Amino acid sequence: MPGTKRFQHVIETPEPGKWELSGYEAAVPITEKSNPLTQDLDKADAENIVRLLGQCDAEIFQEEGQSTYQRLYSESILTTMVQVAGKVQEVLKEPDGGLVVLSGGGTSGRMAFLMSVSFNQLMKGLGQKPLYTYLIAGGDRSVVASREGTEDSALHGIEELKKVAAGKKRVIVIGISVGLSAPFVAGQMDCCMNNTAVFLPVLVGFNPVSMARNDPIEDWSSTFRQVAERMQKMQEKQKAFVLNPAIGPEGLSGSSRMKGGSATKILLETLLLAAHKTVDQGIAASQRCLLEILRTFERAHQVTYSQSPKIATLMKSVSTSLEKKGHVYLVGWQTLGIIAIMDGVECIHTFGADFRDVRGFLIFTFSQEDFLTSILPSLTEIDTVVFIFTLDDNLTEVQTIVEQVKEKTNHIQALAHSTVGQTLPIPLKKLFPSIISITWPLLFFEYEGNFIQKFQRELSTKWVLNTVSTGAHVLLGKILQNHMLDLRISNSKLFWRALAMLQRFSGQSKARCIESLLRAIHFPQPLSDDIRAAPISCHVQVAHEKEQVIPIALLSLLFRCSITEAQAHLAAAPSVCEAVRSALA
Numbered sequence: 001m002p003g004t005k006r007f008q009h010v011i012e013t014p015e016p017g018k019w020e021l022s023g024y025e026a027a028v029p030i031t032e033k034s035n036p037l038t039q040d041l042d043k044a045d046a047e048n049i050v051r052l053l054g055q056c057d058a059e060i061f062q063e064e065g066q067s068t069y070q071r072l073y074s075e076s077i078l079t080t081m082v083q084v085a086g087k088v089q090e091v092l093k094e095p096d097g098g099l100v101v102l103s104g105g106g107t108s109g110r111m112a113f114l115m116s117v118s119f120n121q122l123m124k125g126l127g128q129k130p131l132y133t134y135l136i137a138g139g140d141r142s143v144v145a146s147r148e149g150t151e152d153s154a155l156h157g158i159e160e161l162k163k164v165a166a167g168k169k170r171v172i173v174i175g176i177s178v179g180l181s182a183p184f185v186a187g188q189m190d191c192c193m194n195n196t197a198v199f200l201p202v203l204v205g206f207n208p209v210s211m212a213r214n215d216p217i218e219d220w221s222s223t224f225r226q227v228a229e230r231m232q233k234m235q236e237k238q239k240a241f242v243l244n245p246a247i248g249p250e251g252l253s254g255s256s257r258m259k260g261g262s263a264t265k266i267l268l269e270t271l272l273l274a275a276h277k278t279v280d281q282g283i284a285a286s287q288r289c290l291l292e293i294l295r296t297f298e299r300a301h302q303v304t305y306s307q308s309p310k311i312a313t314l315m316k317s318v319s320t321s322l323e324k325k326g327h328v329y330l331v332g333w334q335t336l337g338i339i340a341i342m343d344g345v346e347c348i349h350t351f352g353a354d355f356r357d358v359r360g361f362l363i364f365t366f367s368q369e370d371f372l373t374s375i376l377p378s379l380t381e382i383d384t385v386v387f388i389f390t391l392d393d394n395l396t397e398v399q400t401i402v403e404q405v406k407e408k409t410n411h412i413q414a415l416a417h418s419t420v421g422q423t424l425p426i427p428l429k430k431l432f433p434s435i436i437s438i439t440w441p442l443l444f445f446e447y448e449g450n451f452i453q454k455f456q457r458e459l460s461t462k463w464v465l466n467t468v469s470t471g472a473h474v475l476l477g478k479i480l481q482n483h484m485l486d487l488r489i490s491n492s493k494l495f496w497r498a499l500a501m502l503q504r505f506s507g508q509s510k511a512r513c514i515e516s517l518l519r520a521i522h523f524p525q526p527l528s529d530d531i532r533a534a535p536i537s538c539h540v541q542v543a544h545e546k547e548q549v550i551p552i553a554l555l556s557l558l559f560r561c562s563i564t565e566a567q568a569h570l571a572a573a574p575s576v577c578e579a580v581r582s583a584l585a
């Protein structure tokens with residue numbers, strides 16, 4: 001019937017109590033699963049939230065149990081890292097006409113960008129031509145914007161890839177998609193396999209290939225799953241690689257910007273840095289070199305969450321200022337500035353939040369005086385401003401701006417990275433009472449810009465900011481158990497996530513859930529056979545423009561009522577969240 005094929009890959013809602021034994025659960029990709037640790041994240045206070053997310057992050061480093069999924073420290077994965085470092089070396093010997101592309105959508109694209117800069121700095125420092133570039137769904141602008149809609153085209157991915165691979169002779173394309181999901185990446189990987197002379201694809205994500213996305217892509221014939229099964233067959237001959245350790249579900253379900261983006265850096269910085277540092281030594285990359293780097297990243301998690309209490313306190317002050325209706329400013333220097341802007345932007349699509357609600361700044365790129373002149377005026381009693389820097393930064397630029405803001409704010413906390421035995425200028429630097437000092441043991445780096453120290457700090461800041469931004473919103477009651485129910489449908493994945501969430505919270509059939517969602521999306525237009533059979537992109541395009549799509553659809557299901565009736569009830573309620581939670585009860 002109309003729509004059957006569009007919706008075929010969707011599994012039926014299991015009966016009450018049979019969610020386990022249906023094996024609906026067994027087919028939910030790890031990246032989409034509910035994390036058991038965060039069952040009650042919506043009831044944790046600020047310190048528990050910090051404890052719970054630090055613990056979810058720790059799962060990146062958990063080793064394989066004895067019939068189960070390969071993980072970061074499993075031998076098959078590390079061996080694949082080794083072989084990939086190998087192939088990157090080949091290109092580093094023959095830079096002429098060589099290129100290395102790091103590509104993803106959303107946060108995968110963001111992570112790509114940072115890494116491409118770093119390894120370009122590193123080749124610069126050695127006086128070598130930069131060989132890295134990045135690709136991101138929707139073009140360069142996407143690096144620092146909420147543009148969730150742009151990942152759904154495989155021709156787009158391929159076009160970007162063809163632009164940059166210009167007239168190169170040897171191209172490594174590292175397609176990153178946490179969910180093994182983005183059609184932007186799938187097209188690149190497939191195109192690489194049709195020209196193996198030139199291209200070597202390397203696919204990075206965090207699901208087993210058996211769980212890779214398998215619904216049709218609108219502008220492409222193969223599914224991500226097919227593309228990844230075929231890359232895996234090519235790996236036996238070293239013409240493709242799939243690098244896909246499980247890292248366990250996200251603490252906020254399906255929020256792959258968190259563990260996923262972190263694991264992307266951990267995994268790729270490790271491997272790229274091993275490759276570089278072993279070419280000039282005339283020595284193959286080896287498990288042992290990678291391990292050293294992985295264990296350093298693992299210490300970085302411990303070190304970072306040593307500051308949990310003060311992490312929780314920044315949480316409380318970010319949530320407060322949002323709860324009144326203030327804004328939160330994230331002020332950082334060099335690469336940590338960039339990461340700040342990335343965090344704030346991601347809050348737009350992740351929590352429905354305004355661009356002003358949690359925004360980042362680099363010294364979006366506003367110089368010292370420029371920030372003092374334009375932004376400084378807009379501050380208020382109830383706002384919160386966060387300073388993020390190292391002791392290597394230019395602390396006269398720092399303290400100035402802090403001085404200025406201190407008058408207008410009072411809620412300022414800060415995030416400071418030091419090697420042990422560095423001190424804070426002004427012992428009266430008690431402009432910040434009780435800082436989040438994060439102090440890094442001395443380590444034996446040998447490259448000029450000390451790249452291992454940069455990656456540690458970036459990763460640690462990422463974790464802090466991710467945990468704060470995410471925690472501040474959970475405190476406001478915007479998250480249900482460990483799901484963001486009220487998201488904005490802006491791509492096909494988000495559309496499947498919504499339908500999934502409707503089945504889980506209603507317990508009602510697939511067909512009912514699908515019908516409610518399409519009615520909520522296209523109201524006031526009734527369901528027609530065309531709408532039922534339309535490409536998912538049609539539903540996305542319409543839903544992306546509306547508010548409360550998913551809650552309305554869930555209310556209509558729970559009260560077994562019309563869309564007209566569910567909107568009226570929502571408008572009659574004190575808030576979306578209360579309407580939903582009391583309807584659930």
Ligand SMILES: C[C@](O)(c1ccc(-c2ccc(S(=O)(=O)c3ccc(N)nc3)cc2)cc1)C(F)(F)F
Pocket residue numbers: 028029032033034179180181207211212213214215253254483492493494496497498500501502503504505
């Ligand atoms: C955990 C939960 O059941 C759930 C179950 C499934 C999904 C989900 C399942 C599949 C998709 S998807 O976009 O089709 C997809 C995405 C990635 C992938 N590798 N495979 C499929 C998106 C979301 C999301 C959530 C619920 F409780 F949240 F509903």
Ligand SMILES: O=P(O)(O)OC[C@@H](O)[C@@H](O)[C@H](O)[C@@H](O)CO
Pocket residue numbers: 104105106107108148151176177178179180181182254255256257258346349350
């Ligand atoms: O890396 P994937 O699975 O291809 O996901 C790509 C993007 O959808 C994803 O990073 C999204 O922007 C984030 O908001 C999810 O937290």
